[PDB]
PDB file of all heavy atoms in Angstrom:
ATOM      1  N   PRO B  17      10.295 -18.800  18.734  1.00  0.00           N
ATOM      2  CA  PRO B  17       9.931 -19.717  19.823  1.00  0.00           C
ATOM      3  C   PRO B  17       8.422 -19.846  19.971  1.00  0.00           C
ATOM      4  O   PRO B  17       7.644 -19.004  19.511  1.00  0.00           O
ATOM      5  CB  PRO B  17      10.548 -19.053  21.053  1.00  0.00           C
ATOM      6  CG  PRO B  17      10.479 -17.591  20.732  1.00  0.00           C
ATOM      7  CD  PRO B  17      10.723 -17.486  19.241  1.00  0.00           C
ATOM      8  N   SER B  18       8.002 -20.933  20.633  1.00  0.00           N
ATOM      9  CA  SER B  18       6.567 -21.196  20.743  1.00  0.00           C
ATOM     10  C   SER B  18       5.869 -20.162  21.618  1.00  0.00           C
ATOM     11  O   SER B  18       4.677 -19.899  21.429  1.00  0.00           O
ATOM     12  CB  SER B  18       6.313 -22.613  21.273  1.00  0.00           C
ATOM     13  OG  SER B  18       7.310 -23.014  22.197  1.00  0.00           O
ATOM     14  N   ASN B  19       6.592 -19.561  22.563  1.00  0.00           N
ATOM     15  CA  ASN B  19       6.051 -18.530  23.438  1.00  0.00           C
ATOM     16  C   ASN B  19       6.132 -17.130  22.815  1.00  0.00           C
ATOM     17  O   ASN B  19       5.991 -16.133  23.535  1.00  0.00           O
ATOM     18  CB  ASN B  19       6.778 -18.567  24.789  1.00  0.00           C
ATOM     19  CG  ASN B  19       8.259 -18.224  24.667  1.00  0.00           C
ATOM     20  OD1 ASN B  19       8.795 -18.126  23.563  1.00  0.00           O
ATOM     21  ND2 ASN B  19       8.924 -18.040  25.800  1.00  0.00           N
ATOM     22  N   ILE B  20       6.338 -17.042  21.492  1.00  0.00           N
ATOM     23  CA  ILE B  20       6.511 -15.744  20.837  1.00  0.00           C
ATOM     24  C   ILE B  20       5.325 -14.828  21.134  1.00  0.00           C
ATOM     25  O   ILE B  20       5.495 -13.626  21.351  1.00  0.00           O
ATOM     26  CB  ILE B  20       6.734 -15.920  19.316  1.00  0.00           C
ATOM     27  CG1 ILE B  20       7.133 -14.591  18.658  1.00  0.00           C
ATOM     28  CG2 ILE B  20       5.496 -16.479  18.628  1.00  0.00           C
ATOM     29  CD1 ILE B  20       8.547 -14.163  18.961  1.00  0.00           C
ATOM     30  N   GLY B  21       4.115 -15.388  21.191  1.00  0.00           N
ATOM     31  CA  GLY B  21       2.920 -14.591  21.428  1.00  0.00           C
ATOM     32  C   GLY B  21       2.919 -13.798  22.726  1.00  0.00           C
ATOM     33  O   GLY B  21       2.151 -12.834  22.843  1.00  0.00           O
ATOM     34  N   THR B  22       3.758 -14.176  23.699  1.00  0.00           N
ATOM     35  CA  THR B  22       3.831 -13.496  24.991  1.00  0.00           C
ATOM     36  C   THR B  22       4.856 -12.367  25.028  1.00  0.00           C
ATOM     37  O   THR B  22       4.972 -11.700  26.060  1.00  0.00           O
ATOM     38  CB  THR B  22       4.162 -14.487  26.126  1.00  0.00           C
ATOM     39  OG1 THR B  22       5.555 -14.841  26.086  1.00  0.00           O
ATOM     40  CG2 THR B  22       3.285 -15.742  26.046  1.00  0.00           C
ATOM     41  N   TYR B  23       5.626 -12.159  23.964  1.00  0.00           N
ATOM     42  CA  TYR B  23       6.508 -11.001  23.880  1.00  0.00           C
ATOM     43  C   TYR B  23       5.740  -9.842  23.249  1.00  0.00           C
ATOM     44  O   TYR B  23       4.912 -10.049  22.356  1.00  0.00           O
ATOM     45  CB  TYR B  23       7.752 -11.310  23.049  1.00  0.00           C
ATOM     46  CG  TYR B  23       8.794 -12.243  23.660  1.00  0.00           C
ATOM     47  CD1 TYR B  23       8.592 -13.626  23.709  1.00  0.00           C
ATOM     48  CD2 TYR B  23      10.009 -11.742  24.119  1.00  0.00           C
ATOM     49  CE1 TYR B  23       9.564 -14.481  24.237  1.00  0.00           C
ATOM     50  CE2 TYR B  23      10.983 -12.578  24.639  1.00  0.00           C
ATOM     51  CZ  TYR B  23      10.758 -13.948  24.701  1.00  0.00           C
ATOM     52  OH  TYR B  23      11.742 -14.769  25.233  1.00  0.00           O
ATOM     53  N   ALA B  24       5.997  -8.625  23.728  1.00  0.00           N
ATOM     54  CA  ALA B  24       5.399  -7.458  23.096  1.00  0.00           C
ATOM     55  C   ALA B  24       6.177  -7.092  21.837  1.00  0.00           C
ATOM     56  O   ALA B  24       7.355  -7.443  21.680  1.00  0.00           O
ATOM     57  CB  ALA B  24       5.375  -6.265  24.048  1.00  0.00           C
ATOM     58  N   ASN B  25       5.505  -6.376  20.932  1.00  0.00           N
ATOM     59  CA  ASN B  25       6.194  -5.878  19.747  1.00  0.00           C
ATOM     60  C   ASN B  25       7.418  -5.078  20.182  1.00  0.00           C
ATOM     61  O   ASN B  25       7.325  -4.203  21.044  1.00  0.00           O
ATOM     62  CB  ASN B  25       5.243  -5.023  18.894  1.00  0.00           C
ATOM     63  CG  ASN B  25       4.220  -5.864  18.117  1.00  0.00           C
ATOM     64  OD1 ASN B  25       4.553  -6.920  17.543  1.00  0.00           O
ATOM     65  ND2 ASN B  25       2.965  -5.406  18.103  1.00  0.00           N
ATOM     66  N   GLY B  26       8.579  -5.427  19.638  1.00  0.00           N
ATOM     67  CA  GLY B  26       9.808  -4.751  19.987  1.00  0.00           C
ATOM     68  C   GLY B  26      10.595  -5.371  21.126  1.00  0.00           C
ATOM     69  O   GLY B  26      11.797  -5.091  21.253  1.00  0.00           O
TER      70      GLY B  26
END
Side-chain angles (χ1 to χ4, degrees):
Chain B
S18 34
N19 64 351
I20 189 74
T22 76
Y23 289 76
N25 285 318

